[PDB]
Amino acid sequence: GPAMAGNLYGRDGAAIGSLQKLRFFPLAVAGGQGARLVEEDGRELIDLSGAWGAASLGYGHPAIIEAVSRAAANPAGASILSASNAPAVALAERLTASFPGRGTHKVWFGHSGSDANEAAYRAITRATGRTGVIAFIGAYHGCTVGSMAFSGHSVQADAAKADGLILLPYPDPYRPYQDDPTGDAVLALLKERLAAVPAGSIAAAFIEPIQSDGGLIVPPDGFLRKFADICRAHGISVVCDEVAVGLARSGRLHCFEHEGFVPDILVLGKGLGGGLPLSAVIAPAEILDCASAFAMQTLHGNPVCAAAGLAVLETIEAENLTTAAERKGKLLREGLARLAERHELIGDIRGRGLACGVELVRNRQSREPARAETAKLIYRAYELGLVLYYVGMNGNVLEMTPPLTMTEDEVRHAVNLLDQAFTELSTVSDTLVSQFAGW
């Protein structure tokens, strides 16, 4: 009753509406250091989710502290709309320099992935005068009217969709569409769907190079390249959404580096900001210059957020985090393989760098999803002092996206906590887990 209602979690219930909440257990945070969160009572936890990938440098990283304090004390105004400002320009410069399109592309800045996907779509349709768009079932591209319009994930399933939207199955090696582990069946479908619409009616294609919230799915080898070829054959812009899986997390700087294509447009978000809201679209000049005063919010490109972004990119260099994500990802995936030797629930282990997914199944032959078991597992992890969540259209993929700065010892220890969670998930009752709405 009153003590529980009076604590930070119970206060959260009383003050903050459930509209934006995605809660699985009563995590109630008052501080953070490194890869640790600190609850109101002082209890420490290891954040395997790394705030869903946003805490790219963990919590209280010196580079973020310095850049944000400096920017606070001497800000170049508060916006990029009606002034140029030094940090946003230098950020935009560094991002386009990182991209193979350095010679032909510019940047738009936003507050979130949703903002950024929304802008890219609006810009392509504006530039092009066409409405049609290809995206994937399971694809999470935002939670705003404009971004949910071409999303395919459960969260957006009730949302109004874009005129000319074609949603395709994302090819899952673990559950392959039409039993084809190559994904060519999806490409054949695409072509067939394209033959049924007017020539040149599709302007855009959205893809995640790993589908994150749809269930950490690394698509079959060659699939994305061949997908991009088709798009290019029809003059369709390829937009790569690397809001979850970009900027060093995959063990390459840009996830598309694993996949033998370069996108026309690259979308970035979450960890770009290091804990502050920051997003960007890197796209051909003629796309982002087709209009002005068109996709704008007052605080877009504010210097504190832009300084945080520069800090993240600078730290990716200084601490060699692209290599560190590769190295620690391998370690993490190896620890998980050892868990699979002990716990039959583990049906699959997948991912690249520190974007890792573990799929849980009731039987390894049937692959029946283990939804109830997954929900309790993460609850028991939280009790044990490990934060991670589940994703996927079946509620049954554990997601791991820790800060790129997480140490090797922390990885080892997260795997051991995970091991104990597997051993103990049914100590969590149905009634307890039922209290949290989840997805």
Add this chain to the structure above:
Amino acid sequence: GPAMAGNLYGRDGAAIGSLQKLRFFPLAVAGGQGARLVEEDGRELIDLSGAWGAASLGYGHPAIIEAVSRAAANPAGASILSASNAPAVALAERLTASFPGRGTHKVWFGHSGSDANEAAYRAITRATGRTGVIAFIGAYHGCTVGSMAFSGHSVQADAAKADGLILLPYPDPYRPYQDDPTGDAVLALLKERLAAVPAGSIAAAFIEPIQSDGGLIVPPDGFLRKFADICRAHGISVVCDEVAVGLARSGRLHCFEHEGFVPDILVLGKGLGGGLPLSAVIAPAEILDCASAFAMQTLHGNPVCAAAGLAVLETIEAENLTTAAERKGKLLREGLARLAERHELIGDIRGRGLACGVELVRNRQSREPARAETAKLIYRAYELGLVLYYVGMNGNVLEMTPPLTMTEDEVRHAVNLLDQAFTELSTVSDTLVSQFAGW
């Protein structure tokens, strides 16, 4: 050529797409202190726009520095979605405590005004299962697909509009609809429009208590109260958008305090964040609890942004800024009245606190808007070291929304720079002003 292209402004052109730009002159900022901006070359300017109202506490205010550094060094994670966090909860607590609905309302957090208006609409329609909405011509409620749907300003004029949207004329004492300075003609229209739709089909009404970008219009006395009565008679939720004109700027904490009604929903933004992206919807519980995992972005309610918000509210108390905005607004408006004795171009002076508008006309009898003259005026102000912009559906209202911390001497000096701009606006050529796209 190359020197100009190499400077901060020319670099802005090369790196950042025009999509989000709203440029009137080549302002190119590298720092900021108090109510001053500092350009790349070191030239200082007084920021009368206060970054469009976002720089509520000016630049480098000690309270914002401290709160943002503290939060950076020890963040309570990075989000409110899958954890409660201490700064967001305390912010939400303080905001609901400020509102007359303290007993019945909760908070949603967003990144921008657009985000926040979008959420409120989606929440009302979700709670209610109705789509219809009332808003005003000239009303700027956002620049995202979901917020432009019930906006009425030029920026959103091409955007897809909400099914059941009714757009009304906003009653302008200076140009009154149907020659009725009371606004009752607008209310009569509303009722007539409402008689033509099915009973209970309209869920929401959006209003700015002063219309800001539609031309700093303070509506006639009693109009908003009577408008709210009608809405209430039809069970329609009144959403008050105080993203531009809220939190002390009007000389009361909440602008609706001037207008004899309490809204059902209050929307806040811009200056709430003090230079960081922050917004909030304060709305009845049953509206914000009608769903979960519904209107969510990863970095919503991040602690750095929430700490900045707490700093702003705390500074509004410590420095008594509600009174300071009233006092300095009066001063500003008096200086402007003296300008009107010298410059026939000044047709009207209006506003409340430090939300002030000056309407420029070719002739005071005709009230013909002076669009070209306004564009040059602000260009000449920029040259002289004063930043302010124009708004309004006729391009002819100078807007003044300086930091609430701007000193009385700075006000006096801004008025003198303004005086010289009026005296010298035609020193600016057509060719020079033409280089900037504006709205």
